[PDB]
Amino acid sequence: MSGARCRTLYPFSGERHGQGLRFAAGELITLLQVPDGGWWEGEKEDGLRGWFPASYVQLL
């Protein structure tokens, strides 16, 4: 465990402009940043990256 993993509940959206990073529901995503009470960048096997709040993910 190099970085902390988290399971997405239900990834909701609204501002879809450019290559916005879409997670799947129930998906196992590791964070790429660790600010205490901040935004975390999710990694995907898809190969893209983007920062989202803890609201859409659940720390494992």
- How many Cα neighbours within 13 Å face the side chain of 57? 23
State how far the Cα of 10 lies from the Cα of 26, in Å rounded to an integer.
7
Task: Decide: helix, strand or coil at residue 56.
Answer: helix
| Residue 1 domain boundaries | 1-60
Task: Decide: helix, strand or coil at residue 55.
Answer: helix
Residue 8 in contact with residue 54, Cβ under 8 Å? no
Q: Is the dihedral of CA 27, 33, 38, 40 positive or negative?
A: negative
Task: Find the radius of gyration of the CA atoms of the chain.
Answer: 11
| Number of domains observed in the structure of the chain | 1
For 53, the token pair is 């709040």
Kind of pairing between the strands at 57-59 and 40-43:
unpaired
CATH of the domain at 41: 2.30.30.40
State how far the Cα of 21 lies from the Cα of 50, in Å rounded to an integer.
6
State how far the Cα of 23 lies from the Cα of 32, in Å rounded to an integer.
15
